[PDB]
Nucleic acid binder design. Structure first.
Lengths: 160, 179, 122, 128, 52, 187
RNA sequence: GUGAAAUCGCUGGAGUGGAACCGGAGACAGUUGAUUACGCCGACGGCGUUGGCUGCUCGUUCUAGCCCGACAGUGUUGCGUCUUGCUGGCGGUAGUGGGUUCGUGGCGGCUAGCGUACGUCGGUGUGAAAGUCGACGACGUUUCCGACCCGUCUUGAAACACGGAUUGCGGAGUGCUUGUCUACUGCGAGUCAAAGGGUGUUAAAACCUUGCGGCGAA
RNA sequence: ACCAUCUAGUAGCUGGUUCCUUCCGAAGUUUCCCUCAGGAUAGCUGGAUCUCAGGCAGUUAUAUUCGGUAAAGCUAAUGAUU
RNA sequence: CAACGUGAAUGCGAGGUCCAAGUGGGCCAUUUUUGGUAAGCAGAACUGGCGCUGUGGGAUGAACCAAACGUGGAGUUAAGGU
RNA sequence: AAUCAACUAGCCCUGAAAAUGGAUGGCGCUUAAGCGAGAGACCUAUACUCCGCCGUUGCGACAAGGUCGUAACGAGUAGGAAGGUCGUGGCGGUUGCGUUGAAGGCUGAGCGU
């Protein structure tokens, strides 16, 4: 059986990227984190304090606490037939804002703005629903300067 | 695997093209002559060959047209030459074969049956590179050439006739020679 | 694009294609059953369609057929109102049921030949 | 036949008895049905060519269940006063004198049933 | 008579038999495990807001 | 064959009271009729609680009845409860209460009647309010049982306040190891 | 007293090629029922439902050939940029005109199971009895199909794994103390009352009876 | 030694464990145990039901992410090596 | 407090509590994979099966192919065949 | 008037030896009843469609611990529940039968899955 140390099998997971070692740039510390925000977890090997467990690497969580240089995150973890919302205290260096929620918030803003504009201007309420890409419509293709090229299977050649 | 199912394979002309993108607002149009049982198989085989030849697959491409081709004059006999490439249990080979038929589709069907008979090769291992009508003087296979004679004649030597809708037993004498 | 991936996932177990006018009408008239309060009720009358789809202006089997064929705004409601069709085995048999249609078999996308199959199944 | 007072025909899904497995092989095993419980019992596992097991699907039609071959349902009578319960639905019930009724009482029972027009199953029995 | 025999064979089926239960929606409402100083200020803020 | 699950086909339910009390069975009959014909969810609720088990009908308190009637608009409404109405010694003033109940204890009945109130049965409620008009539906606290205190996470689990099953109470009865940090640990 | 099963003897019937038993389906033997209308059965029609096989006829899609014109070629007849044939694409289609495809198409023919918008009819049964009709045909015989010995431990038993020659009778989750949950009943901030006492002669019962005790109310 | 009793000694082991229908329906896996033919524990399963009357899903789409396996590379670091 | 009003597809009613059984020897197969010369050998991963399960086919067979089962009938088939 | 050489791959042949007599399942089959490519039709499941009946589940109607309607459904070891006018022996009550023949025993006509 395997040993059960904290950093077993993280040889590449906790390593830095090629030609990306050294001093950690400061935007990491300038980023703003508020409780209720969604963050991706990606361990930074250069910082050994407040490191997330390997199980949480690459997962997204919701912030529930904001301390001086760390955040508490609620991350879903599957244990047998239940998903547990584990709470973990991770430092800022291992955290990154999640764009999935921000995209949705932008879409909500656009929807509200479009609805307000249409109602104010008396236009009919617009369609504010994402729809799956439908099958292509009917069209005409012209062969002018694009004559069809007759293709045939090629014979076998002995490429030594 | 693809099979040459069906008596007398059909012939289709399939025209397709890669779906235009921003970097390529106009794309070349490709055309192929396919021999298949029906048009669904024709389209699938067209995409097979076009993806082999050009960097395009069914996902990024579209079919502009697919039309069945019928023999112009099925009342005349022609010699057909077939250039094909096929896979044996050991290696890859090119073959040239000849048939006599009233339809090019019939000739290609004959080719598939003959390849199965003489080389145990299935349709999934055969590529029909080319099919054409060859002149009588341009044929190069003895079996075909032996019928390019205006005075051809031969009997039917040993004719075994099967009784169709009558009892198994008879007192009649069976004759295999008919002069 | 939201349904085609499912049709690729379930390829080996289904035969599907593009139904035509006669196929849709035959299916609806000969084997149309409605889901009414969780019960499978044969559609022997147009009032049965009206009671459940009247709010969408679908009052007759012809309205239902049009909605299905042209994929109207209420395609979801129209089709969910129908109980999954329970078809008969084709008279003539199948071919392979273990190989794609293009392999000389049965499963996968047969395109407009689903009508040929359904003319025997329905 | 048809149930008396109606036109519904009596149908028997099965006529043979569900005999216990191996009751023909051993005398200690009575024929009365017992569900096989053995781990390897081929009858329990339902191998082809094995005797069937009782199932609710064999149940008789509700309208014809308990109906005798003549079309009536049996009612047991022990004395003359017991004949009253058959008076009204006499077109569907047939009386039957209990086994323990003596030849002394059977005479009166049969006579009263004849007067009341009530059919009996064993009227002409135990005549001394 | 070796008897270690670890395996994970029939475990996903058992897990999925009664479904995989996702966490509830009120779990984000609790203020448990939050900074004590922040909690103290929240108590003070809530204890003083005039109702009307 | 069809690919469906039969695990939850059957739903356990009570189609009639388990009790052999003939009056309770008659009440269940009457309110089954009322629920089916009037089609009122109030009648359905009364029927269900009539068929329920006595565990789910915990005693109600005269104080709770008084609080219900002393609310703006509830003065003239009929309080309907299928729980026993008990007397409260801590209640000093009893208002005018109109209550329809299965059983009311002697003290509660005396106080309600003394305060000018009225007590009716469920059959009488069926005539007064066949559809349940002007009613205030009440019940006792269902989770206020000694047994319920023993339900929940196991006593020896972190952040668990479940009452253990102890023979007696004292320093010698499950108070040493696993309950204080002086002995091994504390959860 | 009764007098079971196993086992056994006789009489009659029937089967009997290296097991015998057994399930399904008939037949035979046998047993049993049977009041013009009505029962128990059959046949032919009609209707409903689900069909199976099989023809015509319109149209639709994609397409010709025949026929005409020039050009190129040649498995070519008759007597040589000859002629007659024949082929190939290409250009025409007026006329003629088949293949292919299927239709929210139209008109047919033969026939099955199940049920009875229902008709036309026959067999039988109204004292016996005989016969006839109907249903079964169950541990009898005979055919066609299926068919390995149960219980058990086991991943796996018909097993060359163990127990079992046969039959009868007996034969194994109980009592009590203590918990806990659940269901039902009474009363309800209470409830139950103990030992005991009083009375009770269809008197080991029932009935009455507690400053105090148990549990609960911190 | 034999006789009676304690004694129906204990057995994580072997054998047996007696009516019919209906409905639902597993596990041989986790952790701890002088534990490995056994237990406790979680899981899987049944029953009782109770509260309600849209938020879920062994499936997709959109958006955003995680990884260092196949392939690739060694005329890129390390280690071989003609 | 004021206003706005349900913002991908498909399917579908959802959630809660309590009491408790049996199990805790597994085995097989496509694919991946460790030890071994190999093994109907030993050990793992995903999924499906047999165990617990009959039915048509593979002459026969726990696992293979088809397909899962109330009790009957008519029609049509799967795999397999004539 | 075609010939020579080297290759290639289909079927066939050699390589190809084991002990009771024996196995494309057997008989047999040779323009096959073999090998490969195909075509019509045909046969056959406890599967699919439709029709009847039994039960379960859900829903519903009815002044009823009942009846009825309707749709879907029905595998099962260990195990769990439900129903049993299934069966056995007592007690408190109730209903009756019996020397004109009870219990017990042997065994025809039926009833119930």
């Amino acid at each position: 059986t395997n040993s059960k140390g904290l950093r077993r099998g993280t040889r590449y997971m906790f390593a830095r990227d090629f030609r990306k070692h050294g001093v950690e740039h400061l935007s990491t510390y300038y980023t703003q984190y508020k409780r209720g925000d969604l963050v991706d977890i990606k361990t930074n090997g250069a910082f050994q304090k407040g490191m997330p467990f390997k199980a949480y690497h690459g997962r997204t969580g919701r912030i529930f606490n904001v301390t001086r240089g760390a955040v508490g995150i609620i991350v879903n973890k599957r244990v047998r037939g239940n998903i547990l919302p584990k709470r973990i205290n991770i430092r800022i260096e291992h955290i990154k804002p999640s764009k999935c929620r921000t995209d949705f918030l932008n879409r909500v803003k656009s929807n509200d703005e479009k609805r307000k504009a249409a109602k104010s201007a008396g236009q009919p309420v617009p369609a504010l629903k994402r729809l799956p890409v439908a099958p292509r419509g009917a069209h005409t293709v012209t062969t002018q300067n694009n004559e069809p090229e007759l293709l045939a299977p090629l014979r076998f050649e002995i490429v030594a | 695997p693809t099979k040459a199912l069906g008596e007398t394979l059909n012939e289709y002309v399939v025209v397709g093209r890669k779906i235009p993108t921003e970097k390529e607002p106009v794309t070349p149009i490709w055309k192929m002559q396919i021999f298949a049982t029906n048009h669904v198989i024709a389209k699938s085989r067209f995409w097979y060959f076009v993806s082999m030849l050009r960097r395009v697959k069914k996902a990024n491409g579209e079919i502009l047209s697919i039309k069945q081709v019928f023999e112009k004059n099925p009342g005349t006999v022609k010699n057909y030459g077939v250039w094909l490439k096929y896979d044996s249990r050991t290696g890859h080979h090119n073959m040239y074969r000849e048939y006599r038929d009233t339809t090019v589709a019939g000739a290609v069907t004959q080719c598939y049956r003959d390849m199965g008979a003489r080389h145990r090769a299935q349709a999934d291992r055969i590529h029909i590179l080319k099919v054409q009508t060859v002149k009588a003087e341009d044929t190069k296979r003895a079996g075909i050439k032996m019928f390019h004679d205006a005075k051809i004649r031969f009997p039917l030597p040993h004719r075994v006739t099967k009784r169709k809708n009558l009892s198994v037993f008879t007192t009649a004498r069976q004759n295999t020679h008919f002069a | 694009k939201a349904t085609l991936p499912l049709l690729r996932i379930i390829e080996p177990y289904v035969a599907w294609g593009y139904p035509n006018n006669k196929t849709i009408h035959d299916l609806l008239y000969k084997r149309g059953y409605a889901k009414v309060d969780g019960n499978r009720v044969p559609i022997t009358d147009n009032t049965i369609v009206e009671q459940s789809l009247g709010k969408f202006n679908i009052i007759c089997l012809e309205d239902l057929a049009h909605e299905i064929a042209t994929v109207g705004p209420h395609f979801k409601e129209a089709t969910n109102f129908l109980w999954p069709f329970k078809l008969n085995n084709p008279t003539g048999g199948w071919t392979k049921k273990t190989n794609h249609f293009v392999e000389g078999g049965d499963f996968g996308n047969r395109e407009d030949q689903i009508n040929n199959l359904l003319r025997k199944m329905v | 036949v048809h149930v008396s007072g109606t036109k519904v025909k009596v149908v028997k899904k099965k006529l043979t008895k569900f005999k216990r497995h191996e009751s023909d092989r051993y005398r200690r095993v009575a024929p009365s049905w017992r569900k096989p419980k053995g781990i390897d019992n081929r009858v329990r596992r339902r191998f082809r060519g094995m005797r069937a097991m009782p199932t609710i699907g064999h149940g008789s039609d509700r309208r014809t269940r308990f109906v005798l071959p003549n079309g009536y349902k049996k009612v047991l009578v022990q004395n003359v006063k017991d004949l009253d319960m058959l008076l009204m639905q006499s077109y569907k019930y047939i009386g039957e004198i209990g086994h323990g009724v003596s030849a002394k009482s059977r005479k009166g029972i049969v006579e009263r049933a004849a007067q009341l027009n009530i059919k009996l199953t064993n009227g002409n029995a135990r005549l001394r | 008579a070796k008897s270690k025999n670890h395996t994970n064979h029939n475990q996903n089926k058992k897990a999925h038999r009664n479904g995989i239960t996702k966490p509830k929606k009120h779990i984000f409402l609790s203020m448990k495990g939050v900074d004590a100083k922040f909690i103290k200020n929240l108590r003070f803020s809530r204890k003083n807001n005039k109702r009307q | 064959g069809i690919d469906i699950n039969h695990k939850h086909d059957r739903v356990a339910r009570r189609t009639a009271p388990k009790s052999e009390n003939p009056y309770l069975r008659l009440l269940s009959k009457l309110y089954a009729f009322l629920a089916r014909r009037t089609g009122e969810k109030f009648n359905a609720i009364v029927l269900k609680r009539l068929r329920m088990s006595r565990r789910n009908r915990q005693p109600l308190s005269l104080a709770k009845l008084a609080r219900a009637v002393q609310k703006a608009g509830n003065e003239n409404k009929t309080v309907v409860t299928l729980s026993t109405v008990t007397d409260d010694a801590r209640l000093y003033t009893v208002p005018k209460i109109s209550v329809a109940a299965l059983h009311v204890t002697e003290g509660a009945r005396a106080r309600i009647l003394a305060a000018g109130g009225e007590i009716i049965t469920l059959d009488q409620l069926a005539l007064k309010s066949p559809k349940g008009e002007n009613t205030v539906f009440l019940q006792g606290p269902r989770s206020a049982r000694e047994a319920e205190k023993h339900f929940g996470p196991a006593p020896g689990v972190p952040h668990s306040h479940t009452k253990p099953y102890v023979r007696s109470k004292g320093r010698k009865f499950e108070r040493a190891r696993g309950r204080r940090a002086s002995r091994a640990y504390k959860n």
